[PDB]
């Protein structure tokens, strides 16, 4: 009873909610910095036909 008073289930659910919220925030930050449309897609031009011709 003393141990359960120290760490209740409410505190456990609060801790896990904080874990999930911080996971969401870290995923947002990591997705912001790794978007290929920033760098990888330099030329969006329709040379798919042209690179087909080069192949």
């Amino acid at each position: 009873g003393e141990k359960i008073k120290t760490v209740s289930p409410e505190r456990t659910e609060r801790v896990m909610d904080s874990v999930m919220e911080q996971r969401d925030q870290i995923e947002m930050m990591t997705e912001a910095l790794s978007d290929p449309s920033l760098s990888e897609g330099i030329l969006d031009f329709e040379d798919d036909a042209a690179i087909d011709e080069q192949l």
Binding site: D17, M20, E21, R23, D24, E27, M28, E31
Partner: protein, 55 residues
């Protein structure tokens, strides 16, 4: 494809709360139906007591 961890967690919690409330409501509706049946039986009995000569 961003995962909303906290959103899904709270969605599961709200779904469980709604399931609990719906189950208790269904139990109460069944109890109401049974009470209506008992009332009808009591009215039939009252009619028979009236006919038999027992006010």
């Amino acid at each position: 494809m961003v995962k909303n961890w906290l959103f899904g967690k709270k969605r599961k919690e709200d779904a469980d709360a709604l399931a609990t409330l719906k189950g208790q409501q269904n139990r109460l509706q069944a109890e109401a139906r049974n009470l209506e049946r008992q009332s009808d039986e009591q009215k039939i009995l009252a009619s028979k007591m009236l006919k038999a000569g027992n006010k």
